[PDB]
Amino acid sequence: MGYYDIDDVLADGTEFPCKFQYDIPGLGYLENNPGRPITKNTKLSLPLWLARILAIVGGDEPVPFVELLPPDMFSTKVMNAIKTDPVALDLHSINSHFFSLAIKWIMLFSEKELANVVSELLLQRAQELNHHASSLSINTNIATSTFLLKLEEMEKEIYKKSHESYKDTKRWMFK
Amino acid sequence: YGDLGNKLVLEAKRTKQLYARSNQDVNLPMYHEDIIRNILKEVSNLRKNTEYLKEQQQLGMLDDKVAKCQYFVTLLCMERNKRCLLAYQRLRTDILDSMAWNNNGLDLMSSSQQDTNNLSHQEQEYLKEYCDLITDLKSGDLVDIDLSGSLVPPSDVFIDVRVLKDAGEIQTEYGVFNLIKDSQFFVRQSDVERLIQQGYLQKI
Amino acid sequence: GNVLPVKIQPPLLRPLAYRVLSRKYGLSIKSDGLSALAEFVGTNIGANWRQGPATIKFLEQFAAVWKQQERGLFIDQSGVKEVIQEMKERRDYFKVINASQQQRFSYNPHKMQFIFVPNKKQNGLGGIAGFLPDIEDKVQMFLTRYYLTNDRVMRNENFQMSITPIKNLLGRDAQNFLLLGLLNKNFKGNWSLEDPSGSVEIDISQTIPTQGHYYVPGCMVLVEGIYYSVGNKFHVTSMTLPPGERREITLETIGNLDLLGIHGISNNNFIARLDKDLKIRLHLLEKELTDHKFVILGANLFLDDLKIMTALSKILQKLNDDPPTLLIWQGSFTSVPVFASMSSRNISSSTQFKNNFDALATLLSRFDNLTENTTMIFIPGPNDLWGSMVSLGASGTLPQDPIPSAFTKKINKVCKNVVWSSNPTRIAYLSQEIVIFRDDLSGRFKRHRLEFPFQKVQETRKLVKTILDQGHLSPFLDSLRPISWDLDHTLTLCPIPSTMVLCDTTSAQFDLTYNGCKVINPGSFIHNRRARYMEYVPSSKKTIQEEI
Amino acid sequence: TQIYVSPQQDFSDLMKSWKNERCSPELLPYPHQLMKRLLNRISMQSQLIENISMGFLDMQNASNANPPMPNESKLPLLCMETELERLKFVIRSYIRCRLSKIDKFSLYLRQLNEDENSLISLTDLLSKDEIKYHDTHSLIWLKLVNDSILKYMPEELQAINDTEGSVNMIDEPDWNKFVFIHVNGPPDGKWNEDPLLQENEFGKPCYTVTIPDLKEEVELTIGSIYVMRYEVIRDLLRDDKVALI
Amino acid sequence: SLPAHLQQTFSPEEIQFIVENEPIKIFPRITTRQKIHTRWQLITTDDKALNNMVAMRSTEVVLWIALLLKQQSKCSIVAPQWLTTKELDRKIQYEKTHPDRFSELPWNWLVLARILFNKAKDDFHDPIHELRGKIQDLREIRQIKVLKGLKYLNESHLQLDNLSLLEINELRPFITEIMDKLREIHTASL
């Protein structure tokens, strides 16, 4: 949680499905005809940076104005996919802010069943990241590139840092 | 509504990658104050709208729940706009200070970017103030040690130096070096690092 | 050296100089710097090589003076000059400049910033022909003017409705719009508006213009109307010149750029700005300003007739007791244009022109206080030597050449401070910008007023409003007043001057002020058996006097 | 420190402090006395080398006489000057690292300083030049950001130290960051008089630390490198029990 | 210093410096015993050995002084007990016979080796290529053991009893970031 961090600011911008648990006249002006109010139980795709607050304010039965539905990224389908084989999964395709979004979602809703699986996922991916980082040139196969293009954005900085560390050590060793 | 702000923030990320790939402060790009003032005028619109809505809320014909939800939505919009703008500005200031710290605080316009026109006026006066602080810092208790010197540990005393640009002759302590074009020197390491940073010497 | 200088051995002083100039501040001491320091430690022999603080503080003052000039990595033969500066650091500061030496600055529409342009003389050879502008200059001159006007209009508070480029008017009809551009006559002979995008036609049958402006071809105008695709007529219903801006607001957009650089200048390598000494010089100008008065005379003081000479002699008789700071003579100095003489029997017109100024040198001999204490300024008139040679007294090129040296070989020797400049000339005071421009205005704007189908102090109000809102000295096309391709920037009113010396022989005297600037309207030097001239107090006050 | 056994002990302490500060995620206090001694040492050594060099130079330039014998003349002063350059490099790196650290956490330490209940005072952690650096830099940055953006902000949220709403904007140091340590043991040569160390099978004196989040106890023995979070290890580090790598 | 996050780890140059800041034994060629001359009188080293040396007698000086004298002809570096075949053989045997414990080897492993091989090529008793090959074998074996051990990464702590300097330096960022992310996940879950 850093105010001046670019990736967190970008990740706050993703849209999450949610429903109007409460009915408010005069709303929806910013999306549709302003004169027509929004009726109850209306599904919307609101950004995280406001959906996080509007679901906790209550306002007032001090129920919040909005009720947030389970997003499609966190689905039984994806859970099975990540559990069966994580090393070859193109998690980049599902979302490009997966890990920070997962942290925020698990922080909002404590769920012991996601922490362990996500931890195991990234732990298993770390070994292959190290494997590829150690390898250096001295004629190139498709496996390395097709792996590197599946990564999450937050793993790229670890990959680059490790690669630079190994390259610098090799350069110093051989002169 | 603040999606436009993301367009700014995303752009900033690219600039950081420009820093990352190069690993050297150089050629800082042109600012984006146009989108910034677009956000400023839209946030002025938001502020005047919020003030008006508070006016009608105090007037008595406006629903309390509507007033409060409008107020929260507008406040969140302002918060995100401010966050985006300061996120851009902090990175700009950081890279500016990084650039200013290593060139001995003299801005070196004679020989990075040439025009420095890609920086706002406020940024340029901030750069001048930071150069002032950089000059001030080494003038106090640490006068014997140049804080803007090298950072590579001294590993050897005598190195070969090959000339890169032509000049006349330059004095040193107990001697004088004539910078004839394209010659080689066998000199002490701790004498020519200043020239090397200036770009007048090559082949360390 | 000192009273007892001792010649040094350079090796032993080498460490003292090298340490200070290569470890704390500075870099790359040359041999010239070391020899200079040898001489100037000869000037500081007092207990030196055993006395630290004095030489060290002189060296740090040296550094504090040297490091503000460029980057100064090497010490060339200027070092003695900065040492003379050191000696001297232990009314001036005003400059007069002509349109020939004004710095060139382009304007870029894609970067919204002024760009320095190198002068052809400084970098080029200039020994054969360097004053000839290039072909694309006339292509880009109107582009530059339009870009500046567009920026000025769009900076307005009211406009944040938006105008539409001309070419984007093809696909719509029966809709109101707003647009601006050059106003002229098409090849066919109809009224048209031209824009970098394109051009359209104008319907005038029901136009209601904003009064107080001289709607003239060649002037930026704001047009509100309804397009009609049945023909190509943009039916106009309202029309007004764009509004103007004061000096400070236009300046702050570029902070305080060094356009008329006297303290410092910008060039290709770097851009410079300054506001610290502006308030100091303003405070300096606020005092003893009444002592530094400058007086101007009327227009067209012909030095051939006896009456003008007698009146001038009386003026100088009154003036010699109290010489002013600046004296300006404007208008032609000969009542007949000089040109080819087909007869050799009589005096050549060029020789007569030379003779007329010679008598003026003689008349200067009896007013020595004026010749000794007041500088002199001469501004060419419409039918002087170079112009009348091809213009024969009619209007010609505006960036007019100065008076030739060959015909002024005695005035320069009698007086001690005489400067000849172009017809548009700019002087730089401590905190004031003054421009002087001599030509005919009221007749020109009266004869070319646009016609609309449907107490003399109002005319000058209209003239001033038009010339200040347009922001260009010559709001006329190339048909009327041909302008040199590159020097057009001199006629631009970018950051408008503090005071304008607008002399028009066809207009009555006026002292109006508007939009942060004030304008003075001197008349002819003589009128109705009387002669007059005016003086302006730097405290924004004017006086008029008549001496017949 | 209170007194020096030898300047080499001072050098070792300086190097250990530099290593500790380089990897620490939190701004550590300021060892005034060490650099107080070291700057005087550097000045005196520089004066000596300059004096002897000037003596050689002026005896050489007053008359041709005899050039200095190449043996026992060049190499000693060469060693002095290269050692001085090395020490200057080390001190420069330390100072620049501290400057960057105080660059990062400026607002947090400022807001901590004004706290009356906070027993830690800004005077001890920083030198005077560092204090002026912090305050001037903070004012300059605040002026820049106020002119550029905050001038247009509404009255509600113009302050850049707000700690309410959604996101706080004060960057506390991460006390939980994992760091590499080396258990050096007690600085005493007895290395057995601490009231903290215990013993296990085959002797192996050890310290027992506890993690509250995991509710565990971790054993640390002498001569073993561990990877432990920074929070549980501040006291051992400040007592010179363990040295970071 | 920041210079692109150089404020978190050590560059190889700094490692080489901090290793050459260590004492070593020397076999001098010249004598500078005092007349019973210039005082060494350094500030970070006991000058007594420097002042009190005599030719063909063993004494201890810091590494970089020995290197500087080796650049001249006043030096003869004495290699440690590692740099010989019969010790490296028992070392590699120890690694082979114990597949879980890194062998006992100091922090300056392989760095003194690189420096001595680069500079003191001639003073050895053993051929250089044999020693270089055996050192390469040790490097490969320890690299394999490191990869084997890295499989399990607890979120609490870890023990790496016998890693040398460069081996820790190269691996620091990846390991640190992985455990930081794991700790963040666990703490957020509670």
UniProtKB/Swiss-Prot annotation, chain A:
SUPFAM superfamilies: GINS helical bundle-like, PriA/YqbF domain. Gene3D superfamilies: 1.20.58.2050. GO terms for biological process: DNA-templated DNA replication; double-strand break repair via break-induced replication; mitotic DNA replication initiation. It is found in: Nucleus. GO terms for cellular component: CMG complex; DNA replication preinitiation complex; GINS complex; nuclear replication fork; nucleus. The keyword Nucleus applies. It comes from the Eukaryota. InterPro entries: GINS_A (IPR021151), GINS_bundle-like_dom_sf (IPR036224), GINS_Psf3 (IPR010492), GINS_Psf3_sf (IPR038437), PSF3_N (IPR055221). Keywords: DNA replication, Nucleus. Component of the GINS complex which is a heterotetramer of SLD5, PSF1, PSF2 and PSF3. Present with 2205 molecules/cell in log phase SD medium. Functions as part of the GINS complex which plays an essential role in the initiation of DNA replication by binding to DNA replication origins and facilitating the assembly of the DNA replication machinery. Belongs to the GINS3/PSF3 family. This is DNA replication complex GINS protein PSF3. It comes from Saccharomyces cerevisiae (strain ATCC 204508 / S288c). The gene is PSF3.
Swiss-Prot record, chain B:
CDD domains: GINS_A_psf1, GINS_B_Psf1. It is found in: Nucleus. Keywords: Cell cycle, DNA replication, Nucleus. One of its GO terms (cellular component) is nuclear replication fork. One of its GO terms (biological process) is DNA-templated DNA replication. The keyword Cell cycle applies. Belongs to the GINS1/PSF1 family. Required for DNA replication. Functions as part of the GINS complex which plays an essential role in the initiation of DNA replication by binding to DNA replication origins and facilitating the assembly of the DNA replication machinery. Required for the chromatin binding of CDC45. Present with 1431 molecules/cell in log phase SD medium. Component of the GINS complex which is a heterotetramer of SLD5, PSF1, PSF2 and PSF3. Interacts with PSF2. This is DNA replication complex GINS protein PSF1. It comes from Saccharomyces cerevisiae (strain ATCC 204508 / S288c). The gene is PSF1.
From Swiss-Prot, chain D:
It is found in: Nucleus. This is DNA replication complex GINS protein SLD5. The keyword Nucleus applies. Required for DNA replication. Functions as part of the GINS complex which plays an essential role in the initiation of DNA replication by binding to DNA replication origins and facilitating the assembly of the DNA replication machinery. Component of the GINS complex which is a heterotetramer composed of SLD5, PSF1, PSF2 and PSF3. Interacts with PSF2. GO terms for biological process: DNA-templated DNA replication; double-strand break repair via break-induced replication. Keywords: DNA replication, Nucleus. One of its GO terms (cellular component) is nuclear replication fork. It comes from Saccharomyces cerevisiae (strain ATCC 204508 / S288c) (Baker's yeast). It comes from the Eukaryota. The chain holds residues 50 to 294 of 294 of the full protein. Belongs to the GINS4/SLD5 family. The keyword Methyltransferase does not apply. Transmembrane segments: none annotated. Changing L244P: In sld5-13; temperature-sensitive mutant. Defective in DNA replication.
Curated annotation (Swiss-Prot), chain E:
This is DNA replication complex GINS protein PSF2. GO terms for biological process: DNA-templated DNA replication; double-strand break repair via break-induced replication. Its main location: nucleus. The lineage of its organism: Eukaryota, Fungi, Dikarya, Ascomycota, Saccharomycotina. Keywords: DNA replication, Nucleus. Belongs to the GINS2/PSF2 family. PANTHER family: DNA REPLICATION COMPLEX GINS PROTEIN PSF2 (PTHR12772:SF0). One of its GO terms (cellular component) is nucleus. Functions as part of the GINS complex which plays an essential role in the initiation of DNA replication by binding to DNA replication origins and facilitating the assembly of the DNA replication machinery. Pfam families: PSF2_N, Sld5. Component of the GINS complex which is a heterotetramer of SLD5, PSF1, PSF2 and PSF3. Interacts with PSF1 and SLD5. It is found in: Nucleus. The gene is PSF2. It comes from Saccharomyces cerevisiae (strain ATCC 204508 / S288c) (Baker's yeast).
